[PDB]
Ligand binder design. Structure first.
Ligand code: CYC
Lengths: 162, 172, 162, 172, 162, 172, 162, 172, 172, 162, 172, 162
């Protein structure tokens, strides 16, 4: 999985050599940044439910047709609404993983790989998720570097969706 | 490969749950001991050559039959291979110390090694002695109180000992 | 050239993607370590001459035969002694480059590549340079992290020579 | 490729001399502005998609002939290539900003580009307009006073403008 | 471009040999089918405007939000409606090319290659085009083998969009 | 691979004999039903996406544990692989229908599949359900009396069912 | 084995896609041509013996030395004459296989592959077989497209032998 | 490569327009002459060996210096290459006849050929004579009234002559 | 691979000792018989084609079922393979004769051969007959007293017989 | 061109090293054998005409049909007989080249490469040349090692033809 | 590549003639001087390292600017390349001496060398001095009267000088 | 292992062909040279001890520091002196192997491969071995071609060490 640490050893490994000061400074770089990352992860996790419930509504508000239109890809049914909230929880949960790990690794393996295929096969619209992510971005309530860390991964998700 | 951090993430996901305060607290502690881990790696790595060379000299003084004609380390080609193998074992052990997880050591170094020596006709148990040796030197150099801020590194040293024992057990 | 920064972009480039938080933490890692690195580089540069003159003597003291023996590879001639001091200055100069750059890059391209070939062709003994480096290691007069940085590159050279 | 630091080292070596206090002081200053450089890269990179898409829309509204049948951006294959090229130009520009040197941009992106468009029949000057556009958006997003500690980033912005102008001039 | 004829010679060419009875039967196969293909192409071309105007409305009827919602990707503006009709004409025009050529070639090079990238970048929804194609499918007014030919390429487009 | 025609030729040769009137008559009949076989392939192929997507939705509604965290179809990577596998199974089944022989299906798709799922940890029996599903939809779409010249296709449908059952049995 | 049908699926398979109208027209192409092919195959099979006995004589007539000359490669012995007729039957039998299969496949795998090696190793002359094939070509008694099919494969054999 | 059909499509697209009745009528006519085109290809192809061999014999009888020692066709290696080149020229010419377009002949055979012979030291004009020869034989065999339904093939023959002249002009 | 000379060297080394007078004398004798060994190889090699062809004819006359339809040597492809295999067996046997050691024959020809025929369905015992045949012809041609200086070659012939029997035993 | 000398340097060159005693013994090997080789070459060259005229007749005697049969591939015409003698001279001339060079090189490049293609295209029979070579083999009049050298290359040609 | 023997053969063939007594006599003489040629190669080759190292030392003492910082031989990487180039020039020169023809030297070493140094920025004339040096040492070592049977080698030495001058002229 | 004989068959094997006169002359080349080679090998083997004891002293005489200096890489201890004589015996023993085999093969596999690595790891100086080899070179007491053979392999070793 892609983290500042695995990236550091992979580099040394391909060149078939021992770790050097070059790689070590990178790991200390992540170690020092962990403080702000952990703070973000903690806050997102403690407020998971309200952010998820808020984000879902933001989506339904912006794209009202996803609640009335008929089809299994929409949330016009209690089942569709459960799947929808579930998917949102998946996104939120993945960005906290990225904060704890210090890299995009978790999101890349678990969510980005195969994304476009899935959204294509089940007629799911990207803008639906981009909307939910923007809501989480504007309301996580974090400040300082904790916000920069959180936003870094939210925006990363936004780009994968566009 | 995984580092101690991704290891927790992978376990959290398979269950489909967020991290718990226990986990946050546990991972937050790894970050606190970071400095000790950077020093361990720097020192061992900084004495790579000495560790391998001194350990091999001892191995050969203890088991002279490995270098007698016909021995598995006889001829410069087999000897270079032997030294290379030691440096490689040491290299992957330092990766595990940086990562805080033995995955990289297991997937990219230890698996298939036993089969490889069996097929080559290399005394796997003799390799174990070689690595046991580097272990002692490595740790001796890692927690030498001279040249650095005092404090306890005992837990890290015991972890470092683990990866070494782990490799030794994989060939013996 | 290999630096924490070029390593960061090379990684992103091979994966054909934009820089992420992963790489950025690595660069901040080097940025924060630069303070101790620059201090080392400065001290080594201001005391270049005495360390060089000291290291040469340490070599002649340990391997007295390099001053009496006849042959162009030895310092038994004023010319040989100039080449010898010159070579020592090259080593010292290269480790300061590594401190300023934050990586082994400078030393790797300018000194390690081709080293064994050269020492072999001109009958130069590695232990001669390992001795000079140990002297610089014990007498640079640096303390704290500035010493750890300096020693990191000195030891790196020692290993390339053995 | 080189970063602003290795660039000074390479110049020092060709002369065979140690760094001077001027150089130390100069490089010590790059380190001081590091925070501003990390923010620039993060922000631009964080709005990659928007920057490319909005710039292209404008390009096409300004030069509709590029998308009329027969135009170089007509058909989804040529259009995807166009968008890809823009994202690639932007990608190498952000590398230069992190490095503090245009080498990576020149060696791995700009050289041979003019020859490539000439041979393909792609209006190089039209590409210049595309990049000029991302330039304005990129800088607008880089030094937006909202969301961060206040201070002067004017010098960094002017440097950032340089790499963009540098690419535009390499195809026009 | 992929046609029954170019496919026939490509096969012979890779095997580095002369055309044989195998390839010839394939070309005669397309020659005999051309009659129904040409009939389809002709009918689609003579009724281009009404099918295009009909298909656009069918899209606006099914996804009413594409006419009211604000954004350049929607047809809530005279400009957006022109782009929309234009895109529909592109699809129709491409399937006639496939009928005349006897293969998917035209559509593959001119429309399928890069499709997903484009729909992703400009926030265009596939179901919008799938809807327009279904309308053309139900109202081209063709019968017999002329309908089978037309539908073969319409469905081919549908699959590329899903 | 072989088609129903080459299959007879290969049997004739191993015996070193010319074709018999029985064989000519039998092969002459395959030619007579050609039209029905082209329609079957066209229709199924023309509804490829719908068949795979609808079958998977049903699979997941029937066995929700495949998509719960930890399930073999959990995460978009494993899900895409699952959908890909289904489309691939369907693709080779349509080749067999055109050929009138299962050889292509067996040599290039079914062999080694069981071993592959065993090693991956994929519930092979769950795959069987997936394919059983496409089978029903595929046949339903193949012999739908609307839109074509009336006549009997019962024998072809039973043959089409064979290839599907053949694949299902190769993983279950 | 190479047939219009296996060629059609191989093409689709390498491109990793489903069969399209392109490939289907090729199979219908062979299906429609089968009528003339089957007629040829039937006629050649019912008159196998006389054509074989006729072709052998034509060879002995043109190259009289193959009946008097001494050596195991010649038909100057009852054994050599049996081998000779056998070989002719092999050629005839293979062209009927090509007619039934609709391609050169059968002949390519069973007869062309290794041909030159064999004729070289056992001192068999190609012109001997080219002569036998020309006889079959002038006397099969077929007309119309049934003759074109038969001749297509006979000439194909002639070319492999020259 | 393109066939006469895709050629019209490509022109229609660059203009962004549907086909006109003139075009439909024109392409509908190519379909009507299809039978004549299949016969041409079959016959020429069916006499491939004779055409090449007889043409070369004539070339050598006309220019004996090509086979004298030192000549470009002297030694079996250069001779085989010569014969191979002729068969290859003929092969691509038959592809053009099937396609009804010279693109395949131009892109995959004729371009770079002149440069290739110049560099090898092969008398390009001598090659032209070789191909002129196959041209006459090819056409003679193509429209021989014996063995087929009578009718006019004059237009096809003139087209067939074009591709041959086209290749000859590309090396001469 | 090893030749009779390197074979002795390898044995001397594994013991870490110099060669003994017995060894010198023994190797000095191989040098003395060199001329006979060059003649053997030249003659056999000089009749390669005849040996293979005549042996195969006999094999087929003895076991006609190998060439009946369905037989493993039926069809020119399988027949060419058969002849190729024989020529290859003969080729590696002549290398061993030049070397004075069967290593090259064992490592590069005989190992895996039995497994290969088992898997292909080729009657390994039939191959043994083929090689037995070449053996008799090869030796007959090797020590034919006509055309060369008279003398005893009996020991060399018996050695030559060994390599042949060695190959036959490796497939039977 | 393949000679004992070029083979010796090619081996050293691929291993990227200087010539060693290994290669040198090989060149001295050819140097010592040159004496017998040159003697063969000289004798074959001085008796070229009679051996050529003799060999041609031997061919016509064994395969009388090559003098009566009609076709340009036969010597039933003064032109065909000239080509025939010419071809024989080519074979003889090539084996002398092999003797002077000390290897098959000359024959391989000038005669073996493309042989089968040529004999196939112009309907020339290998046994015709094998017969001419056997005549030269039985009548060159050489003895001792000079005969072994000559025969080595004659037989080499025979094998290429079978 | 060609050796002095194949060189004559190639000329004889292009004319289509047998060798003349002049040619036989000339080639017969090369064989007579063979011993001198083997000694030349052995000696030079046997002192490869000394020749390169001593020549380079002299080059650097004569042109110190090549090793000053910025010089083309400054840094161990460029220095190793320099030494490598010298050893390579010497290696191909010894091949020519064994062959008795400069072809191998020209085709595989000298061609493109001038272009290569021009592009690299390496003072080609400085290389010429390097090789001139090895020339003098090489010849000095080749015809040293000590240690071998006396006789005249003057012609061989002049030939040996030719290949060296030939290489020097190819870069200067 | 690399010998004139294995080199001869390897060449034929890569070209996938039978041995020819080219390779055979090379083997006869080695066969004829064996006489001088065997004489060298015999003489070196019978005088092994004195040459070894002489060579060791020559090394200690030239580099006196190897007997006084402290460290396990030196012969300043009875153990170090045993290792030293042992290493010399290895070199001598290997050159006799090369003489018996007729090539560098034995030395290449057993001694050259890995040499530089070993001398680097255990701080052994090449000039130490070059000195011992020069002593053996000046005192083996061989003359004529037996000396040329012996010296060929001694010098070969010298070059590998420099
Ligand atoms: C110019 C772009 C704008 C601007 C920048 C500005 N930034 C800072 C300070 C900080 N920036 C960071 C950001 C990072 N550190 C990292 O390691 C990474 C990668 C993960 C990033 C993105 C940090 C940690 C700081 C310091 C803490 C803080 O939040 O202040 C400054 C202040 C510098 C100082 O300390 O004096 C400034 C001025 N300011 C503007 O007005 C422009 C729009």
């Amino acid at each position: 999985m892609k983290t500042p640490i695995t990236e550091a050893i992979a580099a040394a490994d391909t060149q078939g050599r021992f770790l050097s000061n070059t790689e070590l400074q990178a790991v200390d770089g992540r170690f020092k940044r962990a403080v702000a990352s952990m703070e973000a992860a903690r806050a997102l996790t403690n407020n998971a439910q309200s952010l998820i419930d808020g984000a879902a509504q933001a989506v339904y508000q912006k794209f009202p047709y996803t609640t009335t239109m008929q089809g299994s890809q929409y949330a016009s049914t209690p089942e569709g609404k459960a799947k929808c909230a579930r998917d949102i929880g998946y996104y939120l949960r993945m960005i906290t993983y990225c904060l704890v790990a210090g890299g995009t690794g978790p999101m890349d393996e678990y969510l980005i790989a195969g994304l476009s295929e899935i959204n294509s096969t089940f007629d799911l619209s990207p803008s639906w998720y981009i909307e939910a992510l923007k809501y989480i971005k504007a309301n996580h309530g974090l400040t300082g570097q904790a916000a920069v860390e959180a936003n870094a991964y939210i925006d990363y998700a936004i780009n994968a969706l566009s | 490969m995984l580092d101690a951090f991704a290891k927790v993430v992978a376990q959290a996901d398979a269950r489909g749950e967020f991290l718990t305060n226990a986990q946050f607290d546990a991972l937050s502690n790894l970050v606190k001991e970071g400095n000790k881990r950077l020093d361990a790696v720097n020192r061992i790595t900084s004495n790579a050559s000495t560790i391998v060379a001194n350990a091999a000299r001892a191995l050969f003084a203890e088991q002279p039959q490995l270098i007698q004609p016909g021995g598995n380390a006889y001829t410069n080609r087999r000897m270079a291979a032997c030294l290379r193998d030691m440096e490689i074992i040491l290299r992957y052990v330092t990766y595990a110390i940086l990562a805080g997880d033995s995955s990289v050591l297991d997937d990219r170094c230890l698996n298939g090694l036993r089969e490889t020596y069996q097929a080559l006709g290399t005394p796997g148990s003799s390799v174990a002695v070689a690595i046991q040796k580097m272990k002692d030197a490595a740790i001796a150099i890692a927690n030498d109180p001279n040249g650095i801020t005092p404090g306890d590194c005992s837990a890290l040293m015991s972890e470092i000992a683990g990866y070494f024992d782990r490799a030794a057990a994989a060939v013996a």
